[PDB]
Structure 1
């Protein structure tokens, strides 16, 4: 058995839209291998 936590309350944190772009075709393309951990949400044009 295990005793579990609970969700608190509707708390709203919105994200924001950053500005840069990238081209680089290698797998790391940043600091490490996976990409959806290291890609900025939704970027501005």
Structure 2
């Protein structure tokens, strides 16, 4: 058995839209291998 936590309350944190772009075709393309951990949400044009 295990005793579990609970969700608190509707708390709203919105994200924001950053500005840069990238081209680089290698797998790391940043600091490490996976990409959806290291890609900025939704970027501005």
Query: Normalization by structure 1: what TM-score?
Result: 1.00
| 1:1-45 deviation line (CA, Å, top 9, x unaligned) | 000000000000000000000000000000000000000000000
Distance in 1 separating the partners of 2:32 and 2:41: 17
Distance in 2 separating the partners of 1:18 and 1:9: 28
Aligned structure 1 segments of 4 or more residues deviating by more than 6 angstroms: none
Gaps of 5+ in 1: none
Q: CA RMSD in A?
A: 0.0
Gaps of 5+ in 2: none
Q: Secondary structure at the match of 2:23?
A: coil
